[PDB]
């Protein structure tokens, strides 16, 4: 079958970034800000946290777009603890 | 079937042919098989006014119920349903112009479905010891 | 962890089990062994 | 050479070794309906295929001639097996299966028409149950195509697309009956397939002709018979493990199945058209463009049939060669022992036997195999009396107990020199050992 | 006219290739038959 | 360009089919000659 | 050429079978030459 | 084909276009070793390829089998051996 598939033997890039209070301006530039080309395949770890032994699911939100200005549609895929909210809107994306 | 998920409704072989489906309305599952296709092996003798027909690998019930009805006599031979020939496999012939396979022949006087025995042992009644 | 890799139009050998699940796959142009697997349409080609 | 003598290893003990050889004498009789293969049920394809005219008549004619050659070849092989076979009507294989300590029960099936199709030996049963697609195998597989089974047999898909294997004109049960008759013709009088003499005597004379004295053969008759049926048992047990003859038999079925499956796969090749399916073309395009796409499929499928028919002609030529070789081996190894050294298998060939096999014949070649050797000093000739030369017949001259004696070349048994084991010459050649005291 | 003539040329050339392949096979059988005839001359006629 | 390349593909595949058919026919003669050579070794060199 | 399907697989398969027949034939000829050959370990090319 | 040769070998053009002759499974040197072994097997003991007797005696018995008396045949042994080696030399010189 011929389809949109990853190249076997190529390298995955862990683009997830965890911060506490400060955000580095370098996190919002190349190579983190990557070109989409035909597309991407994502292998995402479901970071299972616990509060009062109650399970919570967290993982990085991904945005896909072009200029990230409200003159353009940005697709956003964001988790909400078991609910995957997917939208494509003319968002005013932040600088950071 | 239990292999259809929520988004799946068609079953395909390795060659891209549809071989099964799940009906979108009733959720009932069916396998799709090709309709029967085959040939008739007809044995003809110049002195005859008809043919002896062999439906290879088909039972006479199948031929009459699913292919075509006919008024000719028939019987289930080892090779398949035979029409317009008498079943005389107990008889044998050393020469045969209508060889049907597996040691069977069609002999014309009507046509007779007869065993083909081109070679036999020369027998003697002398002692073996 | 959010591992990403680029996609491209590629030919793959997909193996499906008796219940319709893709159990194994081969990227045909990735290596010489993958080319043999796709040529023979099998995960373990015969000795040859 | 020391003096006039050379060092030679002469056997001091021997055994009989059996060797299998499968010779393909037949192949599955593939028939294509060119019209049904190229066009299936589609009237728009059949109209165009008629404009290619005689291409399907050539495919059909060449395969009918090829199948006629296979049928003629099978009749010639059966004629060869039954040629000159004379049996006593008193012969009952249920009671008569061993003579002179040699057992043929496994090589001999039931004899006579009262059995029906059960005239297959234990050896042939053991050889046929390891091959699924024999003549009866193909008949049973095609019988199951209309049984309503959920199993999608590949032979049923091939036959519905016009690719069907027809049974041979003589069933493998008839050929096993012919090999059974040819086998019993060697064991009992008139011994019509064993030089007109008892089988044990024929084995003894064949071993003697290799250079073995008759004195050890007629006293070791029990050992020879036990070595012979042990060699036969070794051949039978050899089929329970990876075997070259059984693999050769299975290669006929595997190569035919591969060729037929490869021919069926041509129905899914697009040949540069929009689809390989005539239904998809006819449901997407009108006659002006559908005919262009259908013509691409017709040229591709007819090209595939011409290629398959060329391959089938080549393979059947190889099968005719193999069947000619099998007929020659029957006549010159089983019915008689032709003076050709490695024709009937390798080594010191004593005798050969034949059994039926799927699409061919299996020959069992029995050879004289030395077990242990003695290094001795031999003289290839002697100069005796009034310079008369003598050469040994199928043997050598030996100094045994400081006296000139003769021994066979294949078994060390020193015996006196006599006119029975000597070729005389009025003059002795140079380098013949001088022995004035002989005779 | 070139399009129609090309269809005829391809058909006639395809048929000529099929005839040539059949002729090669038939002549191989004639060579085997002639070899058998020479063996029969040498081993049945000129000698036994 | 696809129409032109398709004419070349059909011609080149037809040529390979013709060459393969000829090669099968020639190897049958090579097998026949090798059988004759093995027979001559056995019946003229190793024995008479 | 990928839209033609198994044409190149068939050409490669037929040539591989033809070459397998040539290899098997060469082994049979070599086996025939070496069958039953016994030599003395005392043989020397420079003296005999 | 990969050498810095100005000569355009037609075999290199064929191989670059996908047409190549592969070597046989056994080298011709191995087959020459087998024909050499088959030839020396007739000259010396145990004469495994000469009916178990010396080569000169095998030639003499083979000539006698044609209807030649053994007397002239064993008295002319050197003439027969020289005729045999002269025949072999004639075959070798015939290739020129
Ligand atoms: C992309 C990356 O490299 N990501 C790492 C992150 C950054 O390097 C850091 O944020 C950059 O900062 C800039 C841009 O200025 O450091 C982390 O580790 C910290 C120590 O390095 C972590 O232990 C924190 O340590 C504190 O001292 C503090 O405030 O950093 C107290 C705070 O309570 C505690 N956070 C907790 C409890 O999660 C983190 O998380 O932030 C682990 C992340 O994988
Ligand atoms: C056929 O099967 C589908 C899939 O299970 C059924 O659709 C579901 O119906 C329920 C009840 O209305 C809904 O809660 C689900 O969300 C539906 N799923 C989907 C994917 O649509 C359907 O009802 C079945 N119909 C029949 C006649 O059996
Ligand atoms: C076709 O004829 C044969 C031969 O008469 C039938 O086979 C015999 O059937 C009887 C029972 O009616 C048995 O006792 C015999 O032993 C059978 N002989 C053989 C050679 O098998 C056969 O049943 C007939 N078939 C049909 C459908 O008429
Ligand atoms: C010599 O003749 C005897 C008598 O016919 C043979 O003895 C029989 O041999 C079989 C084995 O083939 C035994 O099972 C029988 O019990 C023997 N019967 C008797 C009465 O002894 C013997 O085989 C013959 N031997 C040879 C070599 O000719
Ligand atoms: C067919 O008819 C001809 C002419 O009467 C006759 O020679 C031939 O023997 C007949 N054969 C059979 C099988 O009836
Ligand atoms: C063989 O069978 C035929 C037909 O039954 C018979 O005419 C012939 O005489 C038989 N063969 C022998 C040797 O009797
Ligand atoms: C054998 O057949 C002949 C000819 O019918 C007869 O003379 C003889 O008596 C028979 N012998 C036996 C034992 O049946
Ligand atoms: C011959 O060999 C067999 C098997 O080794 C042995 O049983 C037998 O006693 C030997 N006979 C002689 C004469 O050495
Ligand atoms: C044919 O079908 C029967 C019944 O399903 C089965 O027992 C048999 O094994 C089948 N044989 C073949 C050759 O398909």
Swiss-Prot record, chain A:
Taxonomy, superkingdom: Viruses
Residues the record marks as carrying a glycan: 52, 70
Function: Attaches the virion to the cell membrane by interacting with host receptor, initiating the infection.
Annotated protein name in UniProt: Spike protein S1
Gene that produces this protein: S
First-to-last residue of the parent protein present: 63 to 158 of 1356
